[PDB]
């Protein structure tokens, strides 16, 4: 982050808590960016994903075909 | 994501601290 | 070769949540120390503050005086480079000419044109030169604008026979983001809109273009220092007579990129109308074509090695031909090719210099486009085809071409001098028993025109031929 740098740089060489802000700063964005819940990394992730989609595409098209094909009696 | 975020968080913390020693030991 | 000092053993020797006391208790104490400061470009986006806070860091480690109300504006401490987009000489300039190519997001013109004006408005002068004498030559470097747009009036008939060849004339305003030029390549042969196709003068900014510059350290001769002679001359241009004249210390010192070989009558008729020649230094007299062609065609050469060795072998309209240069070979003229191998373009004030200047481009030109043929062509030992001759630069501008004439069991010359800028002679001479494979004026001036060896070469092989 630009920002925490600079307010690092300008409490260090200004002669406030800057570095605090700073750590919580940090803090909030890890808490926000672990917040997604999605532990593995997302290649696994979207390939799972991927395979879902192609399941239920193929399941949706064979409940498609059964329900079409309808003729005995 | 937890593990390489707070790693990246850790590093980045770091690299301020080094750069506020080194403007704090320099200017 | 390795990343064990990122988070392995970076954090571990740094000398958490309450051990950030290091603000107040340790703190009792931007070149190549503190590089987190410096790099202000790569933390943020190049901006209006960051900008100016930059400059203001510059002036104030390198020394230069400037200085304003606070952060976020910045001015530029020169004789009239002041100029704030969105009083001690000229006043504040808002011209169009400093704006428009650093409008919103431009980082280029930025620390160039300031710089370079600084290290050519620098000299030994306290407060008699460094100032007076910059602003004497910034406002006489406006009679040429005037003679720009009175040869503009003049030579209404099309931007390519009066602008780029012939005289000079192709030239543009200087200020801020372009300074001053002029047309010195003269390449008409190439890349076009397929005689540009534009809407007005072109700022010699689109493409490629020379760069000329106004610097001197010992070249203080008579000039005005205001413009003068400002009124329509009766044909082409006027001079401007001045002596309102003090010892300027300035001069036109251009910037020469490629050591051009020209003739030695060219440079001793030059030295009579500036003072002395365009170069005082050893003149390097070695095999001029030689070094000129390598010059020419470094720009494209890669790094891998050529090792051509007076060799000019080439490509053809559908096959591989070769050729030669003549390098090195004392004619009978006697002594050798001259060589101008420097860069020194140390000129003077701008006196009669009306065609001074355009007949050793236009000298350069034909000679660079003689060895146009051989620029990246590289290919040996070819069987068929290889119209090999050899350009063989006897008197001043005057090339040579042998091919296999089917009229005759032996090579065919042809005199080709340059005698006018762009019309070049293409005469030949036959034999007493040769069939007519020579071609008439008009395949002479087509190939003037291309002014190209291979196209010279691919005409005698598909047209002259005609076999």
């Known amino acids: 982050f630009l920002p925490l740098v600079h307010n690092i740089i300008k409490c260090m060489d200004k002669d406030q808590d800057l570095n605090a802000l700073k750590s919580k700063f940090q803090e909030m964005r890890k808490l926000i960016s672990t917040m997604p819940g999605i532990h593995l990394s997302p290649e696994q992730q979207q390939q799972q994903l991927q395979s879902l989609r192609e399941q239920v595409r193929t399941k949706n098209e064979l409940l498609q075909k059964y329900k079409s094909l309808c003729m005995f009696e | ?27 | 070769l390795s990343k064990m000092s990122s988070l392995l053993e970076r954090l571990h020797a740094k000398f958490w949540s309450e051990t950030i006391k290091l603000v107040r208790q340790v703190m009792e104490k931007q070149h190549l120390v503190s590089c987190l400061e410096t790099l202000q470009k790569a933390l943020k986006v190049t901006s209006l503050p960051a900008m100016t806070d930059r400059l203001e860091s510059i002036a104030r480690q390198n020394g230069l005086g400037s200085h304003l109300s606070a952060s976020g504006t910045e001015c530029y401490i020169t004789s009239d480079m002041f100029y704030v987009e969105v009083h001690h000489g000229e006043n504040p300039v808002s011209c169009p000419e400093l704006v428009q190519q650093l409008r919103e997001k431009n980082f280029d013109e930025f620390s160039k044109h300031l710089k370079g004006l600084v290290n050519l408005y620098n000299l030994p002068g306290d407060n008699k030169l460094k100032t007076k004498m910059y602003l004497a030559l910034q406002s006489l470097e406006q009679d040429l604008s005037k003679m720009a747009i009175m040869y503009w009036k003049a030579t209404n008939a099309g931007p390519l026979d009066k602008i780029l060849h012939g005289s000079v004339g192709y030239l543009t305003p200087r200020s801020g983001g372009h300074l001053m030029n002029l047309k010195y390549y003269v390449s008409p042969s190439d890349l076009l809109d397929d005689i540009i196709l534009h809407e007005n003068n072109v700022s010699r900014s689109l493409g490629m273009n020379a760069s000329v510059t106004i610097e001197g350290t010992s070249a203080v001769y008579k000039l005005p220092i205001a413009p003068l002679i400002m009124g329509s001359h009766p044909v082409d241009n006027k001079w401007t007579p001045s002596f309102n004249s003090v010892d300027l210390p300035a001069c036109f010192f251009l910037k020469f990129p490629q050591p051009i070989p020209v003739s030695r009558a060219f440079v001793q008729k030059l030295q009579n109308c500036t003072g002395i020649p365009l170069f005082e230094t050893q003149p390097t007299y070695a095999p001029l074509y030689e070094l000129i062609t390598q010059f020419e065609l470094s720009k494209d050469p890669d790094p891998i090695p050529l090792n051509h060795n007076m060799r000019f072998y080439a490509a053809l309209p559908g096959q591989q031909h070769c050729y030669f240069l003549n390098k090195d070979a004392p004619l009978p003229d006697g002594r050798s090719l001259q060589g101008t191998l420097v860069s020194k373009i140390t000129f003077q004030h701008p006196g009669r210099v009306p065609l001074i200047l355009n007949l050793i481009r236009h000298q350069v030109a034909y000679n660079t486009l003689i060895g146009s043929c051989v620029k990246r062509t590289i290919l040996k030992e070819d069987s068929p085809g290889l119209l090999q001759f050899e350009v063989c630069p006897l008197s001043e501008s005057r090339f040579s071409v042998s091919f296999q004439h089917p009229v005759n069991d032996s090579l065919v010359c042809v005199v080709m001098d340059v005698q006018d800028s762009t019309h070049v002679s293409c005469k030949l001479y036959k034999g007493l028993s040769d069939a007519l494979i020579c071609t008439d004026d008009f395949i002479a001036k087509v190939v003037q025109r291309c002014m190209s060896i291979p196209v010279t070469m691919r005409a005698i092989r598909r047209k002259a031929e005609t076999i």
Do not use: W
């Open chain 2, 1 to 27: 994501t937890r593990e390489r975020l707070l790693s990246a968080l850790e590093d980045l913390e770091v690299l301020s601290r080094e750069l506020i020693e080194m403007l704090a030991i320099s200017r």
